[PDB]
């Protein structure tokens, strides 16, 4: 909230970019994303599997399991992996907004450097 912070004292501090220390926003965004994505459907699962070109020969359980584990493991001590986080988030939103699914490689690289 604001009872323990301040806009004029928490807008920027040139903080470093560590990969071992967990961030409230990291676990918060990942938790929420996994909770909302946990209700994935055949349509969503298929959409993602198609965009990422992943093997959709499995089942809804396999797809949801892969994504869930990806985001869940994306925040592991000494094994950070935000790539899957942004990728999954984009996929979910895209399907939730009915947006086009561009190249997984191109898009990923764009969000990576961007």
UniProtKB/Swiss-Prot annotation:
- Where does this polypeptide localize? Cytoplasm; Nucleus; Bud neck
Q: Where are the residues of the annotated region Disordered?
A: 4-24
PTM description: Phosphorylated in early M-phase.
| Acidic residues bias (residue ranges) | 4-16
Q: Which residue range or ranges hold the SAP domain?
A: 37-71
Its domain of life? Eukaryota
Family to which the UniProt record says this protein belongs: Belongs to the PIAS family.
Q: Briefly, what is this protein's role?
A: Acts as an E3 ligase mediating SUMO/Smt3 attachment to septins and PCNA. May be involved in chromosome maintenance.
Print the miscellaneous field.
Present with 149 molecules/cell in log phase SD medium.
Question: Assembly and interactions?
Answer: Interacts with UBC9 and CDC3.
**Could you give the domain comment from the record?**
The SAP domain is required for nuclear targeting.
- Protein name (Swiss-Prot/TrEMBL): E3 SUMO-protein ligase SIZ1
Q: Which organism is it from?
A: Saccharomyces cerevisiae (strain ATCC 204508 / S288c)
Q: Which gene encodes it?
A: SIZ1
**What stretch of the whole protein does this chain cover?**
1 to 111 of 904
